[PDB]
Write a protein that binds this ligand. Structure first.
Ligand SMILES: O=C(Nc1nc2cccc(-c3ccc(CN4CCS(=O)(=O)CC4)cc3)n2n1)C1CC1
Length: 283
Protein backbone atom coordinates (compact mmCIF):
# COMPACT_ATOMS: atom_id res chain seq x y z
CA UNK A 1 0.00 0.00 0.00
CA UNK A 2 2.97 2.30 0.79
CA UNK A 3 5.73 3.80 -1.39
CA UNK A 4 9.23 4.36 -0.01
CA UNK A 5 9.46 7.73 -1.83
CA UNK A 6 6.36 9.16 -0.11
CA UNK A 7 7.55 8.34 3.40
CA UNK A 8 9.24 11.36 5.07
CA UNK A 9 11.40 10.83 8.17
CA UNK A 10 10.44 13.07 11.11
CA UNK A 11 12.25 11.60 14.12
CA UNK A 12 13.67 8.55 15.90
CA UNK A 13 11.24 6.90 18.31
CA UNK A 14 13.52 4.14 19.54
CA UNK A 15 16.63 2.18 18.59
CA UNK A 16 17.72 -1.29 19.74
CA UNK A 17 20.24 -3.99 18.81
CA UNK A 18 18.09 -5.43 16.02
CA UNK A 19 15.33 -2.84 15.46
CA UNK A 20 14.41 0.82 15.10
CA UNK A 21 11.12 2.77 15.08
CA UNK A 22 10.73 6.17 13.38
CA UNK A 23 8.02 8.81 13.20
CA UNK A 24 7.36 9.45 9.50
CA UNK A 25 4.82 11.32 7.42
CA UNK A 26 3.21 9.36 4.64
CA UNK A 27 2.52 12.04 2.05
CA UNK A 28 1.65 10.54 -1.40
CA UNK A 29 0.15 13.85 -2.63
CA UNK A 30 3.35 15.59 -1.43
CA UNK A 31 1.23 18.51 -0.18
CA UNK A 32 1.98 18.00 3.52
CA UNK A 33 -1.51 16.46 4.11
CA UNK A 34 -0.64 12.81 4.78
CA UNK A 35 -0.91 11.11 8.14
CA UNK A 36 1.98 10.68 10.56
CA UNK A 37 2.76 6.97 11.01
CA UNK A 38 5.26 4.85 12.96
CA UNK A 39 7.80 2.95 10.88
CA UNK A 40 9.75 -0.03 12.19
CA UNK A 41 12.84 -1.35 10.40
CA UNK A 42 15.76 -3.65 11.16
CA UNK A 43 18.91 -1.77 12.17
CA UNK A 44 21.42 -4.47 11.22
CA UNK A 45 19.60 -6.80 8.85
CA UNK A 46 20.73 -10.40 8.99
CA UNK A 47 18.67 -12.82 6.87
CA UNK A 48 17.60 -14.68 10.00
CA UNK A 49 16.56 -11.34 11.53
CA UNK A 50 14.68 -10.64 8.27
CA UNK A 51 12.80 -13.94 8.44
CA UNK A 52 11.92 -13.18 12.06
CA UNK A 53 10.79 -9.68 11.02
CA UNK A 54 8.52 -11.15 8.30
CA UNK A 55 6.89 -13.34 10.95
CA UNK A 56 6.60 -10.41 13.40
CA UNK A 57 4.78 -8.52 10.61
CA UNK A 58 2.45 -11.50 10.04
CA UNK A 59 1.71 -11.69 13.76
CA UNK A 60 0.87 -7.96 14.04
CA UNK A 61 -1.24 -8.09 10.87
CA UNK A 62 -3.27 -11.00 12.33
CA UNK A 63 -4.07 -9.03 15.52
CA UNK A 64 -7.10 -6.72 15.70
CA UNK A 65 -7.79 -5.52 19.26
CA UNK A 66 -8.40 -2.19 21.06
CA UNK A 67 -5.27 -2.70 23.16
CA UNK A 68 -2.93 -3.76 20.35
CA UNK A 69 -1.14 -1.25 18.10
CA UNK A 70 -2.71 -1.19 14.59
CA UNK A 71 -0.94 -2.55 11.53
CA UNK A 72 -1.09 -0.23 8.53
CA UNK A 73 1.06 -1.98 5.95
CA UNK A 74 4.55 -2.70 4.72
CA UNK A 75 6.98 -0.70 2.61
CA UNK A 76 10.05 -1.89 0.70
CA UNK A 77 12.78 -0.78 -1.72
CA UNK A 78 14.08 -3.08 2.23
CA UNK A 79 11.34 -4.21 4.67
CA UNK A 80 9.52 -1.59 6.71
CA UNK A 81 6.54 -2.20 8.98
CA UNK A 82 4.10 0.70 8.99
CA UNK A 83 1.96 1.14 12.11
CA UNK A 84 -0.36 3.71 13.61
CA UNK A 85 1.49 6.52 15.42
CA UNK A 86 0.57 6.90 19.09
CA UNK A 87 1.27 10.49 20.15
CA UNK A 88 1.83 9.91 23.89
CA UNK A 89 4.49 7.20 23.35
CA UNK A 90 5.55 4.48 25.76
CA UNK A 91 3.65 3.95 29.02
CA UNK A 92 7.10 3.95 30.60
CA UNK A 93 8.03 7.51 29.62
CA UNK A 94 4.44 8.65 30.02
CA UNK A 95 4.20 7.37 33.59
CA UNK A 96 7.57 8.95 34.47
CA UNK A 97 6.47 12.37 33.10
CA UNK A 98 2.90 12.49 34.47
CA UNK A 99 3.34 10.61 37.77
CA UNK A 100 1.69 13.41 39.79
CA UNK A 101 -1.41 13.20 37.53
CA UNK A 102 -1.82 9.40 37.44
CA UNK A 103 -3.44 7.70 40.43
CA UNK A 104 -3.79 4.01 41.32
CA UNK A 105 -7.29 3.78 39.85
CA UNK A 106 -5.69 4.76 36.52
CA UNK A 107 -2.78 2.31 36.95
CA UNK A 108 -5.36 -0.50 37.29
CA UNK A 109 -7.29 0.62 34.24
CA UNK A 110 -4.01 0.34 32.25
CA UNK A 111 -3.27 -2.98 33.96
CA UNK A 112 -6.69 -4.33 32.98
CA UNK A 113 -6.29 -3.25 29.35
CA UNK A 114 -2.90 -4.98 29.25
CA UNK A 115 -4.55 -8.26 30.50
CA UNK A 116 -7.26 -8.09 27.81
CA UNK A 117 -4.63 -7.51 25.14
CA UNK A 118 -2.60 -10.42 26.56
CA UNK A 119 -5.63 -12.72 26.81
CA UNK A 120 -6.38 -11.95 23.16
CA UNK A 121 -2.81 -13.02 22.31
CA UNK A 122 -3.07 -16.32 24.20
CA UNK A 123 -6.26 -16.89 22.23
CA UNK A 124 -4.16 -17.09 19.05
CA UNK A 125 -1.52 -19.14 20.86
CA UNK A 126 0.91 -16.22 20.71
CA UNK A 127 3.60 -15.89 23.39
CA UNK A 128 4.77 -12.29 23.68
CA UNK A 129 8.06 -12.85 25.57
CA UNK A 130 8.69 -9.09 25.99
CA UNK A 131 6.04 -7.57 28.26
CA UNK A 132 7.46 -4.39 29.77
CA UNK A 133 6.18 -0.83 30.10
CA UNK A 134 8.70 0.26 27.41
CA UNK A 135 6.68 -1.91 24.95
CA UNK A 136 3.29 -0.54 26.00
CA UNK A 137 2.03 2.54 24.22
CA UNK A 138 -0.37 5.25 25.29
CA UNK A 139 -3.08 6.16 22.78
CA UNK A 140 -4.77 8.62 25.14
CA UNK A 141 -5.29 9.19 28.87
CA UNK A 142 -7.75 6.28 29.02
CA UNK A 143 -6.17 3.78 26.60
CA UNK A 144 -3.00 1.70 26.37
CA UNK A 145 -1.84 -0.72 23.67
CA UNK A 146 0.74 -3.46 23.43
CA UNK A 147 3.08 -1.86 20.92
CA UNK A 148 5.94 -4.20 19.99
CA UNK A 149 5.97 -7.87 18.89
CA UNK A 150 9.61 -8.51 17.89
CA UNK A 151 10.02 -11.48 20.26
CA UNK A 152 6.49 -12.93 19.87
CA UNK A 153 6.23 -16.64 19.01
CA UNK A 154 3.41 -18.99 18.02
CA UNK A 155 3.01 -22.08 20.20
CA UNK A 156 3.19 -25.36 18.27
CA UNK A 157 -0.06 -27.34 18.11
CA UNK A 158 1.13 -30.19 20.36
CA UNK A 159 2.81 -28.10 23.08
CA UNK A 160 1.96 -25.46 25.70
CA UNK A 161 5.49 -24.02 25.74
CA UNK A 162 8.01 -22.85 23.17
CA UNK A 163 11.80 -23.24 23.56
CA UNK A 164 14.23 -20.68 22.16
CA UNK A 165 17.53 -19.09 23.07
CA UNK A 166 18.37 -16.13 20.85
CA UNK A 167 21.93 -14.66 20.74
CA UNK A 168 22.94 -11.50 22.62
CA UNK A 169 20.87 -9.53 25.15
CA UNK A 170 17.74 -10.96 26.81
CA UNK A 171 15.48 -8.91 29.18
CA UNK A 172 16.42 -11.27 32.01
CA UNK A 173 14.86 -9.21 34.82
CA UNK A 174 11.34 -9.77 33.37
CA UNK A 175 11.94 -13.50 32.72
CA UNK A 176 10.33 -16.34 34.62
CA UNK A 177 12.88 -18.73 36.18
CA UNK A 178 12.00 -21.57 33.72
CA UNK A 179 12.73 -19.11 30.88
CA UNK A 180 16.16 -18.35 32.38
CA UNK A 181 17.07 -21.98 33.12
CA UNK A 182 15.27 -23.87 30.33
CA UNK A 183 14.41 -21.26 27.65
CA UNK A 184 10.76 -22.32 28.07
CA UNK A 185 8.20 -19.65 27.13
CA UNK A 186 4.47 -20.08 27.73
CA UNK A 187 1.33 -18.13 28.62
CA UNK A 188 2.59 -18.52 32.24
CA UNK A 189 5.99 -16.88 31.66
CA UNK A 190 4.04 -14.01 30.07
CA UNK A 191 2.03 -13.93 33.36
CA UNK A 192 5.31 -13.77 35.29
CA UNK A 193 6.41 -10.77 33.14
CA UNK A 194 3.00 -9.19 33.56
CA UNK A 195 3.68 -9.25 37.33
CA UNK A 196 6.88 -7.29 36.69
CA UNK A 197 4.95 -4.82 34.50
CA UNK A 198 2.54 -4.31 37.39
CA UNK A 199 5.51 -3.72 39.69
CA UNK A 200 6.90 -1.15 37.20
CA UNK A 201 3.63 0.78 37.11
CA UNK A 202 3.35 0.95 40.89
CA UNK A 203 6.92 2.18 41.20
CA UNK A 204 5.92 5.05 38.83
CA UNK A 205 9.19 4.26 36.98
CA UNK A 206 11.38 5.64 39.78
CA UNK A 207 14.94 5.21 38.44
CA UNK A 208 16.40 3.32 41.42
CA UNK A 209 13.29 1.11 41.70
CA UNK A 210 13.37 -0.57 38.25
CA UNK A 211 13.76 -4.38 38.20
CA UNK A 212 17.39 -4.23 36.88
CA UNK A 213 18.42 -1.88 39.72
CA UNK A 214 16.56 -3.91 42.40
CA UNK A 215 17.74 -7.40 41.37
CA UNK A 216 21.30 -6.08 40.89
CA UNK A 217 21.23 -4.67 44.45
CA UNK A 218 19.95 -8.03 45.73
CA UNK A 219 22.63 -9.98 43.81
CA UNK A 220 25.49 -7.53 44.35
CA UNK A 221 26.30 -4.72 41.89
CA UNK A 222 28.63 -10.34 33.26
CA UNK A 223 27.77 -13.99 32.58
CA UNK A 224 27.50 -14.55 36.35
CA UNK A 225 24.45 -12.22 36.60
CA UNK A 226 21.93 -14.74 35.21
CA UNK A 227 23.36 -17.48 37.48
CA UNK A 228 22.95 -15.35 40.60
CA UNK A 229 19.52 -14.23 39.37
CA UNK A 230 18.39 -17.84 38.97
CA UNK A 231 19.53 -18.73 42.50
CA UNK A 232 17.84 -15.68 44.03
CA UNK A 233 14.48 -16.57 42.44
CA UNK A 234 14.72 -20.26 43.43
CA UNK A 235 15.15 -19.06 47.02
CA UNK A 236 11.95 -16.97 46.68
CA UNK A 237 13.90 -13.69 46.49
CA UNK A 238 11.60 -11.09 44.91
CA UNK A 239 11.05 -7.44 43.95
CA UNK A 240 9.94 -5.44 47.03
CA UNK A 241 6.44 -4.05 47.30
CA UNK A 242 6.57 -0.58 45.62
CA UNK A 243 6.08 2.59 47.72
CA UNK A 244 2.39 3.16 48.37
CA UNK A 245 1.34 -0.11 46.71
CA UNK A 246 -1.67 -1.78 48.42
CA UNK A 247 -1.16 -5.27 49.91
CA UNK A 248 -3.84 -6.59 47.54
CA UNK A 249 -2.11 -5.32 44.34
CA UNK A 250 1.19 -6.70 45.62
CA UNK A 251 -0.59 -10.03 46.29
CA UNK A 252 -1.43 -10.18 42.57
CA UNK A 253 2.24 -9.48 41.72
CA UNK A 254 3.54 -12.19 44.05
CA UNK A 255 1.00 -14.69 42.69
CA UNK A 256 2.28 -13.94 39.18
CA UNK A 257 5.78 -14.63 40.54
CA UNK A 258 5.16 -18.27 41.49
CA UNK A 259 8.10 -20.63 40.89
CA UNK A 260 5.42 -23.28 40.12
CA UNK A 261 4.50 -22.37 36.55
CA UNK A 262 1.10 -24.07 36.88
CA UNK A 263 0.06 -22.09 39.97
CA UNK A 264 0.29 -18.69 38.26
CA UNK A 265 -3.12 -17.12 37.51
CA UNK A 266 -4.56 -16.92 34.00
CA UNK A 267 -4.95 -13.57 32.22
CA UNK A 268 -8.72 -13.60 32.51
CA UNK A 269 -8.55 -14.23 36.28
CA UNK A 270 -6.04 -11.39 36.54
CA UNK A 271 -8.58 -9.14 34.76
CA UNK A 272 -11.37 -10.26 37.16
CA UNK A 273 -9.31 -9.54 40.24
CA UNK A 274 -8.07 -6.16 38.95
CA UNK A 275 -11.55 -5.04 37.79
CA UNK A 276 -12.90 -6.10 41.19
CA UNK A 277 -10.22 -4.05 42.99
CA UNK A 278 -11.04 -1.09 40.70
CA UNK A 279 -14.76 -1.17 41.56
CA UNK A 280 -13.92 -1.47 45.29
CA UNK A 281 -11.85 1.73 44.94
CA UNK A 282 -14.64 3.56 43.10
CA UNK A 283 -17.94 2.17 44.46
O1 LIG B 1 6.85 6.87 20.59
C1 LIG B 1 5.91 7.54 20.21
N1 LIG B 1 4.95 7.05 19.39
C2 LIG B 1 4.95 5.70 18.96
N2 LIG B 1 4.03 5.19 18.13
C3 LIG B 1 4.36 3.91 17.95
C4 LIG B 1 3.71 2.96 17.16
C5 LIG B 1 4.30 1.70 17.09
C6 LIG B 1 5.46 1.43 17.83
C7 LIG B 1 6.04 2.41 18.66
C8 LIG B 1 7.16 2.09 19.44
C9 LIG B 1 7.19 0.88 20.14
C10 LIG B 1 8.32 0.52 20.89
C11 LIG B 1 9.44 1.35 20.94
C12 LIG B 1 10.67 0.93 21.77
N3 LIG B 1 11.60 0.06 21.01
C13 LIG B 1 12.35 0.72 19.91
C14 LIG B 1 13.35 -0.23 19.30
S1 LIG B 1 12.73 -1.68 18.49
O2 LIG B 1 13.58 -2.81 18.81
O3 LIG B 1 12.41 -1.36 17.11
C15 LIG B 1 11.22 -1.79 19.43
C16 LIG B 1 11.27 -1.38 20.88
C17 LIG B 1 9.41 2.56 20.23
C18 LIG B 1 8.27 2.95 19.53
N4 LIG B 1 5.48 3.65 18.65
N5 LIG B 1 5.85 4.75 19.32
C19 LIG B 1 5.79 8.98 20.67
C20 LIG B 1 6.46 9.32 22.02
C21 LIG B 1 7.09 9.81 20.71
Amino acid sequence: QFEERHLKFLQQLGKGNFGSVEMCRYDPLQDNTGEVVAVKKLQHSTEEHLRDFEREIEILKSLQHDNIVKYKGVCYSNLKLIMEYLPYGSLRDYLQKHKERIDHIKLLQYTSQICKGMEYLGTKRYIHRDLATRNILVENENRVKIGDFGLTKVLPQDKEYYKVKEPGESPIFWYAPESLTESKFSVASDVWSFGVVLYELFTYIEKSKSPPAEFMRMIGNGQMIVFHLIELLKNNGRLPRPDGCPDEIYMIMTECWNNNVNQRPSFRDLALRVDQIRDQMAG
